[PDB]
RNA sequence: UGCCUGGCGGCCGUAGCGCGGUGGUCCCACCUGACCCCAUGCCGAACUCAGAAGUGAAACGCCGUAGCGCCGAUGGUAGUGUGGGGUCUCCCCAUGCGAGAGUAGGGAACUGCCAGGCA
RNA sequence: CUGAAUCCAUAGGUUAAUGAGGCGAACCGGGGGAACUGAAACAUCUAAGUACCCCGAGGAAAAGAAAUCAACCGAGAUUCC
RNA sequence: UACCUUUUGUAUAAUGGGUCAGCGACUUAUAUUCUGUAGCAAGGUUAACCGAAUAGGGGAGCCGAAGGGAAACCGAGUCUU
RNA sequence: GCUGGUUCUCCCCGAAAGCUAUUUAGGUAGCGCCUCGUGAAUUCAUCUCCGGGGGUAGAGCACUGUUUCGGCAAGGGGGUCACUUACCAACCCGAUGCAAACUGCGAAUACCGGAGAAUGUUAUCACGGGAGACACACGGCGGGUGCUAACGUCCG
RNA sequence: UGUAACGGGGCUAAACCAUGCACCGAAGCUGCGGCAGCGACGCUUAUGCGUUGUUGGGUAGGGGAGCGUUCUGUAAGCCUG
RNA sequence: UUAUUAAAAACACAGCACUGUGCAAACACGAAAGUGGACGUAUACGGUGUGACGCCUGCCCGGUGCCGGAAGGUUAAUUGAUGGGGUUAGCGCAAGCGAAGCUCUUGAUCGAAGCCCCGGUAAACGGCGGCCGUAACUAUAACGGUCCUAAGGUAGCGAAAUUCCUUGUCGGGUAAGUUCCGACCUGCACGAAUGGCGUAAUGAUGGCCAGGCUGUCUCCACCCGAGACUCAGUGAAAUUGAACUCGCUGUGAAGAUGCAGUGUACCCGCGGCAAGACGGAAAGACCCCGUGAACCUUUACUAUAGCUUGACACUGAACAUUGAGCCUUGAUGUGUAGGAUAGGUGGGAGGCUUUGAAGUGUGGACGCCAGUCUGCAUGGAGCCGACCUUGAAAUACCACCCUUUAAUGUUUGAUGUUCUAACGUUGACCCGUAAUCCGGGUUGCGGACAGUGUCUGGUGGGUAGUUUGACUGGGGCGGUCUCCUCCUAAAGAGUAACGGAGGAGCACGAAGGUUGGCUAAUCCUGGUCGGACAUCAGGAGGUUAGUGCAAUGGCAUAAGCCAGCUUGACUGCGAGCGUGACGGCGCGAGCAGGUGCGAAAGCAGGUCAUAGUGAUCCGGUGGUUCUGAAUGGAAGGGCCAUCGCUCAACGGAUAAAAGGUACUCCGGGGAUAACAGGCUGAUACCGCCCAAGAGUUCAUAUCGACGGCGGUGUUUGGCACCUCGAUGUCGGCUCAUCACAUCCUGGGGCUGAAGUAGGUCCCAAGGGUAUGGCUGUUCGCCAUUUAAAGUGGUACGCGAGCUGGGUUUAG
């Protein structure tokens, strides 16, 4: 209900992205978080945490 | 207090969400609704009857977890069915004669209790108002003053 | 290989708690000197250091003490599977399995490997 | 052959020749046309352009010669299994 | 202490029959699954139609001997990466 | 999806009124159960022994609640303008009970697996075909509800 | 409603308590005879027997094996004033 | 007026009132013609309410309906400016871009009605209530202080419709009157055309009383006729499994002619009475079910007839006025102090001017004449700005510009005037035609109006098709349906109830992982503001503290606490196991890649765990040249991930649905209530025991507190059993029967029994056990007698005997 379902993107040019909730009305910043990419094989940083 | 008492509060906003879709475009931008809110109706009207359910589902979703009543109280105002906006509207027009007949003595508390109000317009538009009546001509400028209270009504900024 | 100490295990109170005595060459614990190697939302009690001067005070090990904790019979009793019976809200009979609690009693541990010191 | 409003002409009137008027079991084409029922209910739908009503001729009717199909090769009317 | 049905439970005073004679009820069609049986066999089998009219011709076509994936595709291998 | 009837004979086998789900609760599908057919291993059942966890019966009050008796009693109440009282009592101690929502303890049976002598028309399991049924009643045992009131309801 | 709280008569044991020996007592068991299903060994092979033991209450239901009637081929055969 | 149970208070009625209607009238019948209204004309017709007559009809426009007004907001069809996509001539040695045309899509401007909004409309639908406190119960029932309402009952008539106790209680009526009549009051609701009060006459109208009258009755008796009976003739019926068809007790699917026991009973007719054969006549009408049917209601759903608005066509010619966008064209902005008719956003201490200026005048013109702009030359060399003040400082200039508005051209609307040639004419005249149809011709009157056809906005239970799920409750409404925890649960698992307690639809980017580190409640002593915690120094306790949240089980290797790094809360998987019928769900070693932690051994595929959730179909996004109905694309489809449920009825019938039927019907059910019958004694009645106390002494001579055990059980109740293809009530009349827990009579005991008269208890059922008013009464009150006017069973007896007064379908 609070929770704002949100999408994670990476940073690179692929378009895979990931799935989460988070709370907009107590951590309004956007998240600084990397998790693994299998497109490029890589870890690789995510960002626009709505 | 009860599952069942939740239940009919639930459907009856539900029923309030089916009616915002059954909603005009020009309309629709007139209520203080949210982007993420607005851009779920634009879709729920051009998606096929079931998903329209669906959608019904998903407005009545993240309505129930925020506040309702500026938005109910928002679309009264629209629907001219809430007791403040008919009575509001009594005395836009109350002050029209009141200022349309003198042009003087009624700008001071439009002034005084409302900051926005551009007296430098104003009194011209007075002048016009005052010219066309005493002429006899049709009112082509009486409609604009009314605009522009009722727009300075609710904030126009 | 005989005694003492230390480490790692077997079992987890017949394995502990309490009281008294014993130990410093050796094995252990406090105590000294404190530019550094280790880092704090707060000092070298308590975890990291370069040193053996003292002490066995506390702790630890060992021995005795049955005060406590603990284990624990035999019999008895409650309960119960099977079948039958009664005055059938509950009991008895034949047989089988057998309580808990309590008493006598036991109990102040035993054991494997390795290292060091004394014979 | 006659023949007004209105002069011509028409509308109309009379006579003559030709065809039909109605009936018939099914089939054809067209014009209208539901519900019971199914979906285990029910509105989309099916039920069904079915039952039923009307119109026209037929021995059959309808349709019948591509502004058709197909696919870069190609068939050259309609109808029926 | 009748019969039939209903039910956990009926002679029950729960239902049905006055009797006799006749009539009276799991069929048919099209698909699909399985079994028995018969032919053929990696092949089996013809519809419509012609017809010496249940013969014969007719292999149009259907099923199977290769499967995997939604599909392109691959193949005693196939989908995911 | 209801009521009623379904007609000749013989032989063999032969359950349930239960679970799940159902705009479902008198119906229906799967399972539980029945029958027939194929295949399969001492497959399965009975008993003996061995390896298992309970918290049930019982018992207990260490833990969680209720509660009694006696001893020591902090303190509360009044009066005397530190003392006392025929008022009450926290806590601890020894004893006595109870508890489905308590177990420092703890059975008999039930269940799981292994080994074995004997018996049982494979009685065991897998698949396929066809079902029926999904309204149970009573009695005994251990219970919930009810007054252990019921030809009472719901349980194994 | 009429004895109606042993079924009745009736019983002072023909009631109760404990023991012993008997008897009656079912479609239970045994005896005799007969039938049917089920495995297995030996006579042997489309198969019955010296057998062998066992099973055989039964609704819904399932499986198996049969009787009777009409008509068709058999059948211009047979019985038949 | 309900043929065939309701004749009335119901309907109607002349009258009264309101509203609609100007003739081609409104309305109705009709796809339409046409007809009725009416061959009538607002003193007429239609609709609605009331219902002679007399006195009158009080207040309120809040919602709905109606009328008028329209100032304003929202609003479809209609028209097509931008934006994007597809295709490609071409430009690119390619990736890509992209001319024109065509196509698909979002949709700016025009857009009325309608909705609201304002004032009326109540002889329209409707409404005239509270909360605190005072008397008045005066001759007539009217006075204060308030709510969130628009407003609180005028007169008329009070015992009214809630309100109760001693049928309300006094009087008539009667010896006795739950009915009747005017009245006391503690009464005010209705209630004034859903009409109020009175009303003569009238009524097969409701209720009561009186006089005459009588077999209505105590109490019936006789007689006259037709049946009933016998004889002669003709000759049905419903019902029937078969009967060789007794009573009583008990059992039994629970009311037995058929069973067990026992008793009685020769066989068979006829005339009778009806207690039984849960008797006969109807597949109940009383209750329930059906994802049955049909009617009715609506602010339930989807629709529609009809009404109504607009656009397009029929549908035209001359104009006049004027609303809206677009292109420059120059002004245009008086709250105040202030040189004074200051517009907001930035630069700003200067630009301009001899390509000829400050400052003097007219013309045109803005114009609130307060003021200003400007062609012209006169004129012959110049103007500002912080200036102090203003909220805000400049005609010192450079721009996006907003509003008002001035003059051309462009586009599209709206209003008004004239005409006829469309169209209308139930106006006149003439002809077909000895014709109130119709057609044709002239003229008059309207006139591009009305009306009609398609689409569209609004209204639209008037009409049509549906829905209103399951569980039990009631005057109206509610709650439950999914998941999780403990017990019930009987020691594998699982196990229900309207069994007792509860919680969840989140949260966390840290509250996860790794690494390292640490261990509280409660209490004692000491200690300052400081207290029953502030944080502690020393102590018995190794978890009784904590574990994000309800509960449970666990947690020291801590899962509890703190810090650094951190994303393993990762991608593709995943042998195997468990749970369920299954969909699904959970655990999951281990492999490949890339990571975080620590040195490493190793851990990390989320949170200590158990609830924090939703399968499929169909929608948005990205990727996949996977496919692309001739070729190349494209559109579309498929696959993967992903957000998409109060689908909450949570295994999720529609995307879309509320109620009643006593006007109901159909098919079933004792699968399911009520009364009665047998379990029952919670409550209450009856008996006994325990016996403190009161009793002149003295417990049971007579009571007896706190308790216990028993019995019918006729009140207040619940349980499984049913007759729903039928079990008829309450009460009265006739008829009775049985038990004694005895009302009298009879026999006694005790007595606090002198006699009569009494009181209690025991035995005894042979007999007897009332007449009237009230109300339908059972009961009860009253009046009056006796010996009393008994208690219960009889399915609270008796309708195949009667009664229909209560209950009573239809009005």
């Known amino acids: ?50 | 207090v009860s599952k069942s008492e939740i239940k009919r509060d639930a459907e009856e906003l539900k029923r309030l969400g089916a009616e915002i879709v059954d909603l005009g475009k020009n309309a629709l931008d007139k209520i203080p609704l949210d982007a993420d809110l607005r851009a779920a109706i634009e879709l729920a009207q051009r998606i096929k009857m079931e998903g329209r359910r669906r959608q019904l589902q998903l407005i009545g979703k993240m309505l129930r977890q925020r506040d309702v009543e500026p938005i109910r109280q928002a679309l009264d105002k629209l629907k001219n069915r809430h007791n403040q906006q008919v009575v509001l509207f009594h005395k836009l027009e109350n002050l029209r004669d009141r200022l349309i007949d003198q042009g003087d003595d009624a700008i001071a508390e439009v002034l005084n209790l409302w900051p926005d109000a551009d007296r430098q317009q104003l009194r011209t538009l007075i002048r016009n108002a005052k010219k066309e009546k005493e002429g006899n001509k049709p009112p082509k400028s009486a409609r604009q003053i009314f605009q522009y209270l009722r727009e300075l009504a609710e904030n126009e900024g």
């Open chain 1, 1 to 50: 209900g609070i929770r704002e379902k949100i999408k994670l993107v990476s940073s690179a040019g692929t378009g895979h992205f990931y799935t989460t909730t988070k709370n907009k009305r107590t951590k309004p910043e956007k998240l600084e978080l990397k998790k693994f990419d299998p497109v490029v094989r890589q870890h690789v940083i995510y960002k626009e945490a709505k």
